[PDB]
Unconditional design. Structure first.
Length: 120
């Protein structure tokens, strides 16, 4: 009489799974030509990015987003899409428009939005 056993069902498994294959596709060798910088966290030291810490308050990398997935730390794809768009925005936030890394970020983001938006 009380027992509701109610909840927005799983399916999000199918989301986070689909959110996966995206990233798995995002790591693809064909997209390597512009995905490789974003594979691992930016080495401000090795890259000498003196002010990247003062600006990028919440840096993100594809490797970092990948770990949260395996950790089931993402509630849903919207959380998942946020870290990704968090990754790019930093590329946009830190550097000038005409820079190459932005161009690499954009073509990578283009692949993302297509598969991402075409989730059911
Ligand atoms: O040379 C490399 N590996 O051997 C390398 C280079 C760049 C990155 C990278 C990924 S994201 C990101 C970023 O946000 C801004 C910047 N810059 C802003 C100035 O132009 C050159 C760099 O470096 C990155 C990662 C690895």
């Amino acid at each position: 009489g009380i027992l509701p056993a109610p909840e927005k069902s799983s399916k999000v498994s199918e989301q986070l799974k689909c959110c996966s294959g995206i990233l798995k596709e995002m790591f693809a060798k064909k997209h390597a030509a512009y995905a490789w910088p974003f594979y691992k966290p930016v080495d401000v030291e090795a890259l000498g990015l003196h002010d990247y810490c003062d600006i990028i308050k919440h840096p993100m990398d594809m490797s970092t987003i990948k770990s949260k997935l395996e950790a089931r730390e993402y509630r849903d794809a919207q959380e998942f899409g946020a870290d990704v768009r968090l990754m790019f925005s930093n590329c946009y936030k830190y550097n000038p428009p005409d820079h190459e890394v932005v161009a690499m970020a954009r073509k990578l983001q283009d692949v993302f939005e297509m598969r991402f938006a075409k989730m059911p």
